[PDB]
Write a protein that binds this ligand. Structure first.
Ligand SMILES: Nc1ncnc2c1ncn2[C@@H]1O[C@H](COP(=O)(O)OP(=O)(O)O)[C@@H](O)[C@H]1O
Ligand SMILES: [Mg+2]
Ligand SMILES: [Mg+2]
Length: 342
């Protein structure tokens, strides 16, 4: 009785996913009501329908396709909720893309997912509850295929973020991380939260979680830069005009947007927002690691935020800190290695 393993990292910014055949998908965590659209990649054209027990077919665009719409799942103003309509569509769209076409009668889907470090205790059951209740057919209308998502209880496993990304053997060299009596830190800078997780290495090269030197920062993530640039845009505009989410996201890539025949350059505020977010995250990490900061052998930052802020984040200890090889799929790969050896 085999089982197929799909690792899915759920974010308030980007859904990341990878099954045990090393097929990865990633797309923005925005959905949108769908419509008859009337070597293109499927990930940029997610027109989809979801069938349930009520025989509701709910129609959605999700990902890049939904990003390019007037109506949107909020990005800034998406209330934090672990089981919602949008996390169900986003979870079922990531599954739908990572489920093969010829699974045997014996092979069933095993999902590995989780919560941020300190969010785990609070929301392990609510996430295990939404997964238990999955009873949906996900239909990719423009791509002639559909999948059924049903979860066998404890055909699913939940892991707090942090351990998996660290322990990994594809994005790390765990031979060089196993040093006696030293620490190893992770700084996963995400969209709404930021995880700081450290592990003490035993004298027998066994790693131990240090809850004390670890937190989940609830007010610091890349969303701070989005809001500061949203206010910088209306403020600079002095028109009372606001961007939509496709524009605001572009305005936070480089700080340039072409709006109503005006070249809006806010790169000066974007740089300041990134230094200001990065300062806080370095301060919190220093706050948790006192003089024990000298006892580290690596401090690896990761996530989408870690990728864009690495040059600021590195200042926390420049000759010792590094960027993990695939920052955004760093927890999702940890979720694969942990689920597969299970
Ligand atoms: N090329 C890029 N330029 C600027 N920002 C980026 C880029 N790629 C990703 N990001 C930022 O990183 C975020 C993705 O973070 P992610 O690793 O998904 O964390 P979470 O798991 O909390 O969603 C996006 O919302 C975006 O703001
Ligand atoms: Mg994340
Ligand atoms: Mg906290």
């Amino acid at each position: 009785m085999n089982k197929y393993t799909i690792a899915i990292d759920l974010g308030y910014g980007q859904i990341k996913g990878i099954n045990q055949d090393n097929k990865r998908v990633i797309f923005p965590s925005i959905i949108s009501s769908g419509k008859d659209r009337s070597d293109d990649n499927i990930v940029d054209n997610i027109h989809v329908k979801i069938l349930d027990e009520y025989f509701n077919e709910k129609e959605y665009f999700v990902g890049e396709l939904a990003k390019r719409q007037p109506s949107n799942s909020s990005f800034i103003n998406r209330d934090n909720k672990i089981n919602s309509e949008e996390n169900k569509v986003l979870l079922a769209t990531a599954l739908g893309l990572l489920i093969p076409n010829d699974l045997p009668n014996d092979t069933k889907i095993h999902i590995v997912t989780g919560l941020p470090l300190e969010h785990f205790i609070k929301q392990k059951q609510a996430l295990n509850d939404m997964l238990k209740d999955f009873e949906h057919t996900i239909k990719f209308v423009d791509h002639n295929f559909s999948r059924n998502i049903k979860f066998e209880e404890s055909n699913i496993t939940l892991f707090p973020q942090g351990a998996g990304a660290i322990f990994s053997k594809i994005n790390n060299d765990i031979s060089s991380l196993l040093i006696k009596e030293t620490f190893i830190g992770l700084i996963d800078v995400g969209f709404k939260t930021t995880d700081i997780v450290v592990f003490r290495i035993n004298k027998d090269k066994e790693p131990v979680f240090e809850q004390e030197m670890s937190a989940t920062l609830d007010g610091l993530g890349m969303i701070n830069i989005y809001n500061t640039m949203d206010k910088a845009f209306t403020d600079n505009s002095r028109d009372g005009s606001k961007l939509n989410t496709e524009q605001l996201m572009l305005l936070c890539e480089e700080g340039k947007i072409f709006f109503k025949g005006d070249y809006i350059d806010l790169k000066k505020d974007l740089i300041k927002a990134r230094k200001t977010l990065s300062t806080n995250i370095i301060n919190k990490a220093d706050g948790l690691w006192g003089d024990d900061k000298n006892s580290f052998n690596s401090i690896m930052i990761a996530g989408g935020g870690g990728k864009v802020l690495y040059n600021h984040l590195k200042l926390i200890e420049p000759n010792m800190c590094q960027l993990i090889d695939n920052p955004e799929f760093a927890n999702a790969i940890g979720y694969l290695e942990f689920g597969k050896q299970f």
